[PDB]
Design a protein around this ligand. Structure first.
Ligand code: NDP
Ligand code: NDP
Lengths: 223, 223
């Protein structure tokens, strides 16, 4: 049996990934929401597929993050595949027009959030078999891609986490960890939440090497 | 007649840059320190060289940033060359060993501070002739250099500021701004702060192209 963990599983790609793992026999899924009582679709998913456990997590909330380890410890002694999915994307366009609170929010939510989450759940990942670690990044977070758009605090935060993902990959190679930054696609060319999920589950299962920055099709991105 | 702005001029590269600029004719220098009262060497520079103006700046402090434009404005009507030199380097080594507070402090001081500082000083810069905007970054901020060292929050913060620098270079090209990120060298191969300052001041005067990630010697670094 493998244990998957997905932050931000109440909707978007997160929900779709959990929805697909529920169909994989012998998969336990720690799925998170910041408000699990209001996660209608997810709570349904989990009553009909109770291998799905719904845990509370606000990745912007250090007090929430300080509890994620015991919350997950209620359901599992290990994580095989960790997916930092939960993130925000609220601020684009010019620097001169990006106010303080926007820079702050994307940092706390999109960088510190995942770094703390990972720090907390490292012990449970370390006791698992697969030792696979996925940060859902964005192609917008590359220092070497030009989309003809400014991504403001969004892009900066994905670039910051990518930097730290690269380092983590280096640092955990001796422990046989597989660490990746993954662009899941752009979802509603735009691709469906279900299409992104399908590709992410394949990539999650297929990835055998660490320190990669991958798009959902499994092709590499420049850092 | 040119005005330069240097953040963090009480010691290190910043002091050596102000010292180098104070020696050239027609160069007014607005030099900043968190605590000017104790900036002995800088104050003695200013006492003899009245083209050197000292002002308080804590870039970690929104209430200090809220004052820098009006305070710089008492001493000058414009900035030709903006140099965001002030910064910290307190956090290195592995991701799992870097506590929350190091990630935060490096964000606020090394990302948000310079960004906010630039926002406040842009008008003064728009009104000057040279329209040159330098972020002192690190080769440690590259997403594409491996030094076999962990740079933790320091490196993450120079990478994040690099991402936002490259975007700013794109945004301000229509207004004929020159925006660069500049590695000043490793200072105590090691170069001295006076060697770094000599090279940097050369680069500041000569760079006529926006969007560069450069080393003190004018050679390019990969983002
Ligand atoms: N799809 C795209 O266009 C692209 C997306 N990505 C990445 O894919 C991932 C998924 O994005 P997407 O599905 O579009 O996102 P959504 O806009 O659908 O919502 C993001 C998810 O994160 C949750 N979330 C937001 N803030 C917090 C928080 N503070 N604590 C916990 N959970 C939180 C949301 O729950 P809640 O309902 O409460 O907000 C939701 O599950 C993100 O990392 C995103 O950056 C990358 C490339 C482009
Ligand atoms: N040293 C090196 O080899 C390298 C350095 N760099 C970068 O070059 C720049 C200069 O480095 P270096 O001279 O060696 O650094 P130092 O640490 O010697 O000096 C840093 C300067 O920044 C000021 N500063 C620190 N925190 C704040 C704050 N909150 N508000 C305002 N000013 C502040 C310091 O003031 P105070 O005296 O009050 O602390 C000081 O004037 C930095 O951006 C650094 O990251 C990049 C790579 C290589």
């Amino acid at each position: 049996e493998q244990t998957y963990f997905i932050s931000g599983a109440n909707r978007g790609i997160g929900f779709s990934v959990v929805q697909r793992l529920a169909a994989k026999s012998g998969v336990k899924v720690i799925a998170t929401a910041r408000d699990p009582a209001s996660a209608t679709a997810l709570n349904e998913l989990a009553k009909e597929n109770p291998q799905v456990k719904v845990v509370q997590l606000d990745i912007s909330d250090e007090e929430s993050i300080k509890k994620i380890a015991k919350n997950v410890s209620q359901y599992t002694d290990s994580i095989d595949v960790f997916v930092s999915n939960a993130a925000i994307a609220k601020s684009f366009g010019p620097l001169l027009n990006t106010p303080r609170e926007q820079w702050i929010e994307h940092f706390f939510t999109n960088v510190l959030g995942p770094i703390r989450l990972f720090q907390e759940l490292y012990p449970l990942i370390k006791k698992g078999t697969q030792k696979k670690v996925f940060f859902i990044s964005s192609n917008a977070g590359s220092l070497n891609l030009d989309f003809g758009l400014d991504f403001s605090a969004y892009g900066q935060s994905k670039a910051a986490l990518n930097y730290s993902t690269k380092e983590l990959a280096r640092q955990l190679k001796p422990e046989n960890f597989i660490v990746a930054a993954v662009h899941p696609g752009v979802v509603t060319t735009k691709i469906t939440p279900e299409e992104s999920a399908a590709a992410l589950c394949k990539l999650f299962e297929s990835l055998n090497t660490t320190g990669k920055y991958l798009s959902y099709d499994g092709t590499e991105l420049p850092w």
